[PDB]
């Protein structure tokens, strides 16, 4: 998963 503001 991707950082949250990606």
């Amino acid at each position: 998963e991707l950082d949250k503001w990606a």
């Epitope: 998963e1 991707l2 950082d3 949250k4 503001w5 990606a6």
Partner: antibody, heavy 123, light 108 residues
Framework: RITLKESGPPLVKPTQTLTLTCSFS??????????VGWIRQPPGKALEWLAI???????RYSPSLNTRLTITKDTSKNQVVLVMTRVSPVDTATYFC???????????????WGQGITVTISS | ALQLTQSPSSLSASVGDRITITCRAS??????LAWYRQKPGSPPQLLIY???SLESGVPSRFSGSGSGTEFTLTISTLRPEDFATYYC?????????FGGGTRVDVRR
């Protein structure tokens, strides 16, 4: 501006639970985006990422420490709590909690850190 | 997860020296990379955020560049207060990862 701080027990025994608290002031967990993470650092070793929790509650842990960590936030106190269970001497380190901005590009870093609290495990 | 290879892992310099340290990412992290300086006994201190942006209040001698998998932190002129350990951290993927750190001591 923003200052954060770690409280908790400096001495903890193998197996038990380590509850850490991040008290901050200069921002709130009501601000959109704002995150608060926990970074630990063993003695003389590198920084290790533990977990992050945001202004609206999504939390992410460390895949390695996932079943042992629980992060929460009390917005009435502006505190973040971290519970790590069944600790062993390898968990001995300095624990830091830091602030992460929110979108206003620069939420790409943890701009202000606690001063750190060094926990030591020893029965 | 995502590996970050800092190098050199240890460095030896003098004041007024110019040194460039890198941080390699196993996967492209765009520009979500931060740099910190850490003096013994003190907590990390943000120098560069978003890979190339100088953090407010940090001396101009520090600078950063890179994108994707290659990143560097340069100190145009080394100061006494710069002999510490430096770390890079990426905030593009979870978990957020730190490099192993680079050490800068006084050369003799």
């Amino acid at each position: 501006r923003i200052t954060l701080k770690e409280s908790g027990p400096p001495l903890v025994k193998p197996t038990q639970t380590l509850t850490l608290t991040c008290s901050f002031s200069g921002f709130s967990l009501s601000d959109f985006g704002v995150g608060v993470g926990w970074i630990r650092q063993p003695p003389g070793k590198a920084l290790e990422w533990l977990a992050i929790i945001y202004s609206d509650d999504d939390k992410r842990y460390s895949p390695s420490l996932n079943t042992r960590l629980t992060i929460t936030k009390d917005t009435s106190k502006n505190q973040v709590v971290l519970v790590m269970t069944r600790v062993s001497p390898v968990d001995t380190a300095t624990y830091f909690c830091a602030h992460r901005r929110g979108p206003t590009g620069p939420v790409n870093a943890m701009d202000v850190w606690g001063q750190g609290i060094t926990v030591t495990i020893s029965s | 997860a995502l590996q970050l290879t800092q190098s050199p892992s240890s460095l030896s310099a003098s004041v007024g020296d110019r040194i460039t340290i890198t941080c390699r990412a196993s996967q492209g992290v765009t520009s979500a990379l931060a740099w910190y300086r850490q003096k013994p006994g003190s907590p990390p201190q943000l120098l560069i955020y978003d890979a190339s942006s100088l953090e407010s209040g940090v001396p101009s001698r520090f600078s950063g560049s890179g994108s994707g998998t290659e990143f560097t932190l340069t100190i145009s002129t080394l100061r006494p207060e710069d002999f510490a350990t430096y770390y890079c951290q990426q905030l593009h993927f979870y978990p957020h990862t730190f490099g192993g750190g680079t050490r800068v001591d006084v050369r003799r």
